[PDB]
Symmetry: D2
Subunit: 343 residues, 4 copies
């Protein structure tokens, strides 16, 4: 029976947040890497993984020039970053909002193995998620991020993994929407393996169909959600070479066959692509002649900050230089999400 | 695993047929009523239900002026009509094709009760459907029609009815696409009852989500399919009055939340609406400010031919007059599917 | 909601028929092979496939000694055999009932390919099945047979094939139970391939779980049903040798993990096993020390009549001899279904 | 594909624990009530809800006479009780094991609302459940308890609630079995409402079918699991009176139609029944003439300790008396689970 999960005012709030995140020319800066994840990022540049270094790097990303304001519609933060402060004394959420960007929080608690599967996982983090989301909403976080991991193999992704990940994503989205937080569904399919483009497209279509069936079953307000899928690309070990136009065609075709138009926007992850590769693929996707009812933009981590982290080197004097390496990427992707990028 | 149900050439054929059926300004004339169904239509005008009278009425519909050529993209026929001939000696499929329209065939074999349900039904007709579709393809039928019936009640549509009807529609679509015939999925939700607009929208969203999940599970090529849903309208016994704009908003919202953009077009059924009511509702749907990635047109039976059948009266002398009553409707709906209709 | 598909009297009738079919010491003679299927059986012994030869062979099977009366609880017939007559003038159903056996009819219309799968099939025959079942009930048929075919492969049985076959079996069972006919669900998994015992057990468990979930979803009265599964055996090309006790353990374990106790009985198919092999495997299954709440008996075709067909040779003079070859098998299996067989 | 979740040794361990818990004549003492839940229990007898009072009450339950040793096969504990000590200096798990009983832990973290439903809930507690289960296994807990709550209403239990609760139970069971802990699935259907026996039986059958389908999908080793369902009883507000034999018939029928024989045992919850009512209903269930392949015993909370808590009164001097009130119940239920109870 029609028991409304959300009032019209709650739906208005969620839809407004979702449309603000993915406004034309804008994408998402994925800076939500945890302490353990950022450890290798800092060690790659010879930097000790301390609270001060993480805080300074996040400040570098969040205190860039005003040129990134029309490029960044949202910033995903780790829990620690949400309650950290810039040198000027402003909390990071306030800095993000003053730059005209929405604030999001990573709320998943990592992946856990699924027994009886060939190394497949689901993701945890539903316990106490309502109270956590309420606190994040009070603290300025207006959207949330949740990442499910599927992998292509001889017998994977199996039915169990796809079903469980879709169900978990739907539960997460329901809790976030009940707490006034726009959920970003991220059913990432790993590009590991030697699978070709066609297999990736098939797997992505199946996964997205299951995800949106689960979202329908859980009464999810699609207008107040965002999709963060993998780009349809061959496996890293695949021997067949594919053009950017072919990758864009496969990605847009996979989205058009599974993603309802009510979904506000699609924010692609990079999944190991280089910065230029991610920008070119996003630009080709946005130049695809097919009809794309949703916004197609970026939710980029390494692809927005690899050059910034390289130029920083972990030392204070390189800050400005590193910031430039970030800005030039954001602008680039700001063009890529509009189909106007040219290297 | 990716086992292709269709070759690229088969997909090209199906996509071309689907796009030809629902080309801008064009819709479907639903003239597939069986001998038993047309019995009451002929008795309403005092006409004996004989083969000659049915043949002459179908000829009247199919031999109208050339003004209906840019309005009719497809004509659904009953099995008897497929092998009948006009007075000039042309078989009816040839007449339809010479008018620039695609030929479709009703392939379902009626509804049968679902045990353990509150009067819910599924539909039969899968046995030998492959050979029947092959014969229809040889005989000029390029698309097929299949109608599932759901009804809104206190405990209906139940999970069993929705699941069974979606599965049957997916099986039918798979067989038709294997035989080079574009399937039209018609998950009609009956407007009987006193339910309001919101309940109809909720039920339609659930049904369409289940239908498209089933189509994904059965490897259906969505670009070579068409959707024939009910318009989201209140029950006939509902006391609350709704505007045409509200009906259009609810219908477009229900479609946008469940129908993937890959679907070539949406051809609405009338479900008891009067001719003017159906045209006005279709026009309001096409004037909806929301984004509609698929074509929104008509697949009308009574709403295209009620005035024609009334003006005919079962007598030879009224033919031309009756034809006019048909043409004026087609033109009207040809405007309604473009949002350019004005009574 | 609880909408009763069956009245208590209908349930009583179905339960009584089901318990009569699988009474202790009794099994099913599967003589439902169609004209095309029996063609190779008759050609193996140099016999023309004519109506008279099929009628005489079926009479040979159905007019054996009274020693088969406590061994045969049911006989499955093809449509042609249901309306054929013995030499004495008795219709075959009357002969079967006078021998104390229940009459069943094959109601499925063969297998059809599932598009998008690696050679997987579903089975058709639902159209007009209610009227056919009503006629068969009038004509003396008290149970029905329906066979779904799954096959073990690298990517088979897929989710689509298992789901579709379970749904079709549930629809068939619902129609039969509405017409007062006990349905025998036969989800046969083909022993073709080189898969081992463990893979067959896993596949059988998954298939049976899906089948009984489908039966629950379709409100099937399990007490008025029978299960006809494949024995859990390795593939014919498997190199690993297995004992009879291991086959019995795997089969009983697969049944105990998926088959609700409400199911009246399990009537195993042979699936290519020799007559002695089928009897020994059934005996080992019935000697399994695990708890078996349902009756475990035979529904044998070739394994009950291969020696009879060999001894017959298609000539009139061998009738009695052929009958003996049948009787000795029935008695054997009558012991095997009680765990009292000893070669 | 057959990817073993458990090794044969892990399966042996789980099966041995499960069979030890539900050995003939034995049941489960449910003493896992949290601090908040036991608050009203202690306030009903005028006792302050402090750590010492809870510890002393749990000691009273766990240090009863040796007469309860052949009656108690397992004791469920709250987290606090697992690490509390008796007056003699023995930790409570050691006391339980020395009494010949298995130790279980409540691992669910309470219920949370399901949005879009008529007051339906799921249950949380999966996050970090693997590490928690490993610690509990080290600390002497050999089984775990997880309780899903469904309620019968006009539109409840809906498809979403049943599916989500079954999926959560399957995830919990998989994690517990990976950590060597026997999971007790408790899909409790609340007896609140005015529904009759037939509606409760229908709902219980649907819920159990979904639960065991989910367990099959999650590769759950059924032999190493236990079921803790509600007894099939009418709603508390139902006006129709039912006999104990009718309740037993409905319960056993619901179990026989959905619970595979591989399930080691069924440990019924009380759900508000009085102590004598629960014992009489369990005795009638065990006296049911139907075939019951699994052990049918008790997992009782209030129904084993209400008289003990009443006789205790929160004062030290009543300990022995209170213990007697517990023992007389355990013995009673020890007879009830064998069908040998007589009030």
């Amino acid at each position: 029976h029609s028991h409304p999960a959300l009032t019209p005012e709650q739906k208005k709030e969620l839809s407004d947040i979702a449309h603000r995140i993915v406004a034309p020319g804008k994408g998402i800066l994925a800076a939500d890497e945890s302490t353990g994840s950022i450890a290798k990022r800092l060690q790659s540049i010879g930097t000790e993984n301390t609270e001060e270094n993480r805080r300074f790097y996040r400040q570098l990303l969040l205190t860039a020039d005003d040129r990134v304001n029309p490029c960044i519609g949202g910033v995903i933060l780790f829990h620690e970053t949400l309650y950290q402060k810039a040198d000027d004394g402003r909390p990071f959420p306030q800095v993000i909002k003053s730059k005209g960007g929405v604030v999001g929080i990573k709320v998943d608690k990592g992946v856990v193995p699924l027994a009886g599967t060939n190394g497949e996982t689901t993701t945890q983090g539903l316990d106490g998620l309502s109270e956590r989301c309420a606190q994040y909403k009070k603290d300025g976080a207006d959207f949330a991020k949740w990442r499910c991991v599927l992998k292509i193999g001889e017998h994977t992704p199996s039915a169990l993994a796809i079903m469980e990940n879709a169900n978990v994503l739907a539960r997460y989205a329901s809790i976030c929407q009940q707490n006034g937080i726009v959920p970003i569904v991220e059913p990432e399919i790993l590009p590991d393996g030697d699978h070709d483009l066609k297999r990736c497209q098939y797997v992505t279509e199946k996964v997205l169909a299951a995800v949106y069936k689960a979202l329908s079953d859980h009464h999810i307000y699609l207008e107040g959600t965002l999709l963060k899928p993998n780009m349809v690309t061959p496996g890293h070990a695949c021997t067949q070479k594919y053009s950017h136009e072919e990758i864009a065609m496969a990605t847009v075709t996979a989205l058009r066959r599974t993603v309802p138009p009510a979904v506000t926007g699609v924010t692609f992850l990079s999944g190991g692509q280089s910065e230029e590769e991610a920008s070119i693929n996003l630009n080709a996707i946005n130049k695809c002649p097919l009809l794309k009812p949703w916004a197609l933009t970026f939710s980029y981590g390494r692809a927005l900050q690899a050059s910034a982290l390289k130029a920083w080197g972990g030392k204070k004097e390189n800050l400005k230089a590193a910031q430039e390496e970030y800005v030039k990427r954001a602008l680039a992707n700001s063009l890529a999400c509009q189909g106007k990028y040219t290297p």
